[PDB]
């Protein structure tokens, strides 16, 4: 049918590394206003992560070049660097606004399992965090607050509906800790959240699923890696 066709097209685009087309295919599935399968949520998440991740990488490269030129004072170059950075910031805003609109109009309203609700509020936290990463002043404070509110909603559902070993719950704890570290400049709160999620998983390692034990284990190493980076 149409839904299986769009999923197949998403998988072809993924193999071909044509992530715009992957996004467009999974947006059409999301627009059907149905509960996505695990596989469909994962394809949607990978598509947007690749499309935004190319611009986040470009932004950090351009920003690094800008610092270097600020240290040499090359003013001709800085006008061009700043205008190029601003063009990438425009694309980051458009991509984040696209998935955020899909989450608000289709995915969050059709979500009817604890897993799917945590997944979608977490993704909303992630995309407002990406809006906050490169933002200044008011725009940064507004993105940071929207991000924080979505991560709290995800955390509330995750704490009541998912075991502490669930990879969506661990992946939420990882990204939320990163939010506290990078966006709110709070290493203490970042460390507390990451250590608490790690310790709660250790306490109930009997809740590890055959389906996701290696995902859970990887995310628990990433929590430990942040703690290594932050302490």
């Amino acid at each position: 049918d149409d839904r299986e066709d769009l999923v197949y097209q998403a998988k072809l685009a993924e193999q071909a590394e044509r992530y715009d087309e992957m996004v467009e295919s999974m947006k059409k599935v999301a627009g059907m206003d149905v509960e996505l399968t695990v596989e469909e949520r994962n394809l949607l998440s990978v598509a947007y992560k690749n499309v935004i991740g190319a611009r986040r990488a470009s932004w950090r490269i351009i920003s690094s070049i800008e610092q270097k030129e600020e240290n040499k004072g090359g003013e001709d170059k800085l006008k061009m660097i700043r205008e190029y950075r601003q063009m990438v910031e425009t694309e980051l805003k458009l991509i984040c606004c696209d998935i955020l609109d899909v989450l608000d109009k289709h995915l969050i309203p059709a979500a009817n399992t604890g897993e799917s609700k945590v997944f979608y509020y977490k993704m909303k936290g992630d995309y407002h965090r990406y809006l906050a990463e490169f933002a200044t002043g008011n725009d940064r404070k507004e993105a940071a607050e929207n991000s924080l509110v979505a991560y709290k909603a995800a955390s509330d559902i995750a704490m009541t509906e998912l075991p502490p070993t669930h990879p969506i719950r661990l992946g939420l704890a990882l990204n939320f800790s990163v939010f506290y570290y990078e966006i709110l400049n709070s290493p203490d709160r970042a460390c507390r959240l990451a250590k608490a999620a790690f310790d709660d998983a250790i306490a109930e390692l009997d809740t590890l699923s055959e389906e996701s034990y290696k995902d859970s284990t990887l995310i628990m190493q990433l929590l430990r890696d942040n703690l290594t980076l932050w302490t």
Binding site: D126, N175, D225
Partner: peptide, 8 residues
């Protein structure tokens, strides 16, 4: 420069 890892 980044001193954090997120889900990827």
């Amino acid at each position: 420069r980044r001193r954090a890892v997120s889900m990827d």
